[model samples]
Target chain A: ANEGDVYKCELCGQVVKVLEEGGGTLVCCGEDMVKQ
Target chain B: ANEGDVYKCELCGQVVKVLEEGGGTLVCCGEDMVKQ
Candidate 1:
């Protein structure tokens, strides 16, 4: 995902913001995050 | 907060983990975060 984007974990309601661009999926609570 | 602790935003549900111990407050959505 791109920088400055917001992502959330569906399973645990964990929210995270992209501080830097990377080539990996954001995982939280043992699942991939969805962009918001 | 201490390292490895989890914090969530009250206003936006933004979740964050402490990567390192620091003396400042965690802020998200223009407000301080709460420990979870």
Candidate 2:
């Protein structure tokens, strides 16, 4: 699994961590999440 | 700065990403965060 990292949903500014490893986007409110 | 990593707090299962590099815990509910 992936280690310490942060991502935020630009739409809502909601923070979330990755539970899995590798690539892909954390969708939120219908868009890709950006790294914090 | 941190490239990519994930962390989870045991207290409330709150997920956070590494905005900066280095050691330290993501304080959640008044406790150190754990890697998920």
Candidate 3:
């Protein structure tokens, strides 16, 4: 994900904002966050 | 959310499986992950 991007975890509805760019996976609630 | 539950993020079609129980809110895709 990159800065200013938004992602959501389907498992727990944990919404997260991408403050910085990263190549690693964004996991939450045992699942990867989906880019919006 | 609780264990053995499934949730889906319609925003990106991401699915997640709950492994443990939690009382905290779960956000995803700028929204809450609906229980299924």
Candidate 4:
């Protein structure tokens, strides 16, 4: 994902934001990620 | 949650930020909201 892009997990409701360029997929607590 | 606070839905992977006060019970796709 691009810089500053935010993503959310489906199972644990975790949120992660990209700080730099080319950030890959984010995984959390055995959950799912759906980018916003 | 406080104003400008972000939340994620576990079921939909949707992320949302609070803009105003009194935003309550953020439910998405029949899932509970998690604060970030």
TM-score for the A-chain in each candidate structure: 0.78, 0.65, 0.77, 0.61
Cα lDDT of model 1 by residue, A5-33, tens digit:
76665565555655444434444444555
**Top candidate when judged by DockQ against the true structure:** 2
What lDDT does the true structure give each of the candidates? 0.55, 0.51, 0.55, 0.52
Best by TM-score: 1
Q: Tens-digit lDDT track for model 3 on B1-36?
A: 556566655455545555444434544566565666
Q: Candidate 3 clashing pairs?
A: A8-B29, A12-B26, A13-B26, A13-B27, A13-B28, A14-B27, A14-B28, A15-B27
Cα-lDDT of candidate 4: 0.52
lDDT tens digits, residue span B3-36, model 1: 5666666555455555543334445545555678
After TM-score superposition, what is the CA distance of residue B17 in candidate 2 from its true location, in Å? 8.6
Q: In candidate 2, residue B17 scores what lDDT?
A: 58
Cα lDDT tens digits, model 2, A1-36, are: 254565665665556665533333344445555676
lDDT of 3 at A17: 49
lDDT of 2 by residue, B1-36 (tens): 143556655555655554433432244444555664
Please tell me how candidate 2 rates in CAPRI terms: incorrect
Stretches > 4 Å off in candidate 3? B1-36
Model 2 chain A, poorest ten-residue lDDT window? A20-29
Query: Each candidate's TM vs. the true structure?
Result: 0.48, 0.41, 0.47, 0.45
